[model samples]
Target: SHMLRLSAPGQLDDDLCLLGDVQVPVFLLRLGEASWALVEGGISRDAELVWADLCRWVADPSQVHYWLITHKHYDHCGLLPYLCPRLPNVQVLASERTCQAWKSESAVRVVERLNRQLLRAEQRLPEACAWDALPVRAVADGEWLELGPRHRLQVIEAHGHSDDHVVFYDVRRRRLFCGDALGEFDEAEGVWRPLVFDDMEAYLESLERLQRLPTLLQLIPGHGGLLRGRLAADGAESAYTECLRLCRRLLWRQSMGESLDELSEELHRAWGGQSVDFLPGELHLGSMRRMLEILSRQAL
Candidate 1:
């Protein structure tokens, strides 16, 4: 079906091209007569789509002014080297912590390792390229970047998923391009799983921040399965609500004084009628265990 396709052309509301509507989505925002910006770096192939779409929109590739990454994760900013070289004058932008990853050996290794696993066989990726050749601008929290009167993005420090994660709120669309900060939920299962890998308090607090956003029409997640309308609002709230609920459940189970081994199986058991997507038991264990570590660290 069309819905299952790799990508759809940009919705006018999205940008000159939002490119892919699925997981690992990347968008190009038109800033002026000769300037534009991209949201995420996605895979190396994402560069081609943006290039093709720019020509399709009568926007020159050179007009690309910025590449504002949501985070420094491999999938989000992996192709910076290729993209920067291809689009001249494109100043890559992100938070300070994110920029550190560009220059850090350990971070580059993580990207290389993950790319080796995730980069598709069909995609053409540049060999040995990352952040060195490009100019990176580190943005601060609460920075307001303006494209035009109605088109502006407010940078909100959306940590918790990653220490450096930040999401963009487009006043034009009243939409938030959440980078795995609000977490993921499968519509069919209707159970939102918290992805608070860094800090649980920040994760829950960010959710509360999102809930208070003036008027968000949609929550565009880093992954596919984007949320919209009332369903979107409810899904976002469900994620925040479940963050609390799951933390409590994990804490309660931990406080029972059972051995870690005893708690492992029960803690990982699927709750809320939610089904696993992959590796069934193992994936559930990983998610549960990650949450357990956070709760225990906070003395919960």
Candidate 2:
């Protein structure tokens, strides 16, 4: 089959595919004659529909060879346990940190909380979709997989969004399957979300690495529409550059002993408004604390 793309029932082709009516986006790449893979599964509930669609496309569950969980965060990989049984032979792959995170009780609690929220959204899903533990294998930076004679996928560690974040680069297509590492985008407004990173330094390093890639490349972000053509490609580059600039400003503020709340307020003011609901008070505070901790450790 040719490269087939479809929007989930209520979602627009341009909207991010979120849990329920909230949009999210997931991509499927047909690698070989019969092999296929899902990049990042949508939120738990929507991921079921994505899986159903994939089954329909491949006409067999076994044909779906891999499920790439880009990170261990609830939004990204929470659907894996629900998805695993559906594709019995498929191997679930993630980074070492992601695998470790999934094994933590804290991670389980987060997944359960999101699953409950998903239930409240009135999404019809299996009751037993809880992730007790998932069978996951690890992939590292610079790992390469030969999908076909001309198609090669290279794994680039894109940390900072989450400790285990990574992106898959398709050399043949010049497509980068960037999971939150490229930062979030609001497709409706066609603008980048303010920087909500867990590690500013690491994120900057990742951005630098991505900047070295060819300018004429496509970006398939985890939560946004596929960016195609040269203009879209340049937009992706510009987005990375802006993220780096924001990180530097954040670091400078940190060095000046700005409290988490103060820095967050500064960012909000600079960005024009308080957006990014994902950056909860605790998460925001914790990230700032961690950045300080890293700086202190380096100083020693």
Candidate 3:
């Protein structure tokens, strides 16, 4: 049975087009006949390429009405500097917490560094991709972003992967843009890795909350491809199961006196190698240790 279909980075369904590479995809959803909404900005290094791809689908850049940000991750909104300058009419939308994070100089500095690093890796010089004076509007939990006549996305606070994370749900189309709220999915291995980089308690709660949402026909994540049919129907449940399994493994291994380093190594071996450029291996280990600490405290 075709439980889940991993779509490539391009046009997937009738209205949605997955831009950038599979590793860092940005969803370009057509809102109406002429208007459109970009789900994520994608990585800055692929900004030029993504823009070209976007232009092919939506001839006019100004036609992209809303730029929906899932979180403050560089890969998610790093292309904004490139797009904002071009699509001056597009309104950037995100959670208040995300907006606050963007206002921080240190945070933006890190984002700029990472974006430039990706470009430099390919021997390309970095541009003046500043994250200052961005026209970002803070959206609320139950706020509705009316993009077009038929398309309106509801902002749902989905914290776990990050404090400022939010998922956009298209009620009419039965599609959920759950940006890392359900964790990371590996298409090739068909494995689900817990991406609870923030609070484990909140992460679990977010998963439960997402499960309670209206049944979705399409489940679009931050990374990896989208899920369709039966898999999308039970996507939240599957992510929850896999998350709990990881918790159990962490507890069992720690009880057996495994060091944090050892646990990280074990997890990396099982979950495949790290994406050294996008997110450092050290950060993954840090998150694993953080999850273990939270779980261990809860066990007490």
Candidate 4:
């Protein structure tokens, strides 16, 4: 479905295209005269349909110049391989680490295992590319992508969800396209979703960076609906802060020799329905246990 349409001109022009399902929102830029580049490629699933829709939106498939993959995650760059072949002129943009991970034998094996597990679980296979080599351009933190004369998108390295997560900021529109770095969402609760991060410290630091942005008026997340107006952004920010606080508290309790059940109950009680029952029971407890073990080793 058409995700969001901005009415304003300067902050965001009406000509800009925001498309894709609710899970991943892909932004298209009409740069210079006829050049176009996708800010992100959507998740895998019915790849042919997604690509067909994207091509239709851009009018000419050949006109789509770049496929900017935010990170190496399946959800973010899943459809690139399928989409890239169609847009022969497209060059994939990603971080050095992301590209390396994609090419690493170890990484590829891990992804393969993950795919098998998903299939066993009856889950859909995530996007995969089996190309000999795909063209890639590495972008770093604080780097700028000059779209045309006055339009530019700044890359803000915000790693938490992954080692190379980035949020794109359009200077002309003051719009921030935050990938999973912002955290997941609980649509029913109308708040930021509980996180499962590889590095909690880095994730919290990223949140601080986002909080300090001077002109952030809107947040277009990788998943969930668009956060419009300062109020929506503020609420989402507050939710994220609370999530961090909860993570820290849980870690402290675990360090104090609290039982995993006790910590889980406490977290569930505090957040109530906001907490996903199966996550803590199945995965989060192990994560908490590891965190505590790491802390103890550091203390020693």
How many backbone collisions does model 3 have? 0
Winning candidate number (TM-score): 3
Q: Every model's Cα RMSD, please?
A: 4.4, 5.7, 2.2, 5.5
For residue 126, model 2's alpha carbon misses the true position, in angstroms, by 2.0
- For 12-69, candidate 2 gives per-residue lDDT tens digits of 2321222232235555656667776666755666656666666555677787677777
- lDDT at 253, model 1: 72
**Which pairs of residues have clashing backbones in candidate 2?**
16-23, 16-24, 17-23, 17-24, 17-25, 18-23, 18-24
Stretches of candidate 3 exceeding 4 Å from the true structure: 1-3, 121-129, 272-277, 280-282, 298-300
Candidate 1 per-residue lDDT, tens place, 1-300, comes to 222122345653545456643556677676776677777877654556655665676456787777888898777876687667767777887888999888888888867566555545697765434465568888888898775555688889988888999988876677787887877555445566677778878887787787787777666777653456664556557788877876677667767875554554675554423433212225456655675677678756
Tell me model 2's lDDT, rounded to 2 decimals. Answer: 0.61
Top candidate when judged by lDDT against the true structure: 3
Question: What local distance difference test score does each model get?
Answer: 0.69, 0.61, 0.79, 0.62
Ranking the candidates on lDDT from highest down gives 3, 1, 4, 2
Backbone clashes in model 1, listed as residue pairs: none
Instruction: lDDT winner between 1 and 3, please give it.
Output: 3
Off by over 4 Å in 1: 1-16, 32-34, 45-59, 121-124, 127-129, 234-236, 255-288
TM-score between candidate 2 and the true structure: 0.74
- Candidate 3 lDDT over 1-300, as tens digits, reads 135766676888888898877668888888888788888767778877787788889888888878999999887888887778788688899899888877899998878777766775454533443565777888999999888888888999989788999999998888999888887777656656788777778888888998998898998888877888877888888888988887787778877888766777776665545455566436555666676666666552
Model 3 root-mean-square deviation: 2.2
User: What tens digits encode model 4's per-residue C-alpha lDDT throughout 1-300?
Assistant: 222324221223454665555445566777756677777665545355466556665677788777677777655665665667677777887877788877877875544443233233444543445733766788888988875665688888887667878888875676777887766555555456444355666766788788777656667777654666653447446656766665666667767888656765554454444324213233444544444343333332
Error of 4 at 261 (Å): 6.1
